[PDB]
């Protein structure tokens, strides 16, 4: 406890560059696992259409697949607009 505080105090003097570098690196390592917006970033990456969405052959037993883009069925990107 006291020894660690004294060591940090001694390092903050005459060695600020290394203290700042280690602090920034450690913070950048820890924070992503705690931030809630990394899931949002992953969702935005998934929601980016790079390829042509190939339609499916309708057989009368796919209620979750829309028949037109304006239909309610399918994923929605209203959350991205609200961001």
């Amino acid at each position: 406890a006291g020894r660690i505080a004294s060591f940090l105090k001694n390092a903050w003097a005459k060695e600020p560059v290394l203290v700042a570098s280690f602090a920034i690196g450690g913070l950048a390592i820890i924070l992503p696992s705690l931030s809630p917006y990394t899931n949002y970033a992953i969702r935005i990456n998934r929601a980016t259409p790079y390829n042509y969405p190939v339609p499916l052959r309708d057989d009368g037993n796919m209620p979750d697949v829309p028949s037109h883009p304006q239909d309610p069925q399918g994923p929605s990107l209203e959350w991205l607009k609200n961001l």
């Binding site: 690196g25 950048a28 390592i29 992503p32 990394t38 970033a41 992953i42 990456n45 998934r46 980016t48």
Partner: protein, 99 residues
């Protein structure tokens, strides 16, 4: 075709103007009268080469941000940078950066 023409123009202008510079003062007649091999320079050159290789590994990062595997990509990039920091620290602690 465009960049080839641009490079050719650059080289041609440089050569022409260098030759005129080297030939204009030559037309008028005038009188017209080891071992050391320091190791530290080679060591820093090798360190530069190794860090350049690891940078080459680190270069494709801007496109790596769009992979849908954000956690795996982040872990791998942080791992690469951590090993770069470890290489720098190892060269630091055993006096590899001394003059």
């Amino acid at each position: 075709m465009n960049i080839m023409l641009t490079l050719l123009t650059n080289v041609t202008l440089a050569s022409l103007l260098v030759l005129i510079a080297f030939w204009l003062p030559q037309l008028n007649a005038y009188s017209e009268k080891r071992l050391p091999f320091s190791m530290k320079f080679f060591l820093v050159a090798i360190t530069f080469l190794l860090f350049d290789l690891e940078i080459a590994l680190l270069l494709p990062l801007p496109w790596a941000s769009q992979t849908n595997n954000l956690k795996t990509m982040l872990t791998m990039a942080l791992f690469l940078l951590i090993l770069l920091a470890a290489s720098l620290a190892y060269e630091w602690t055993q006096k590899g950066l001394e003059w």
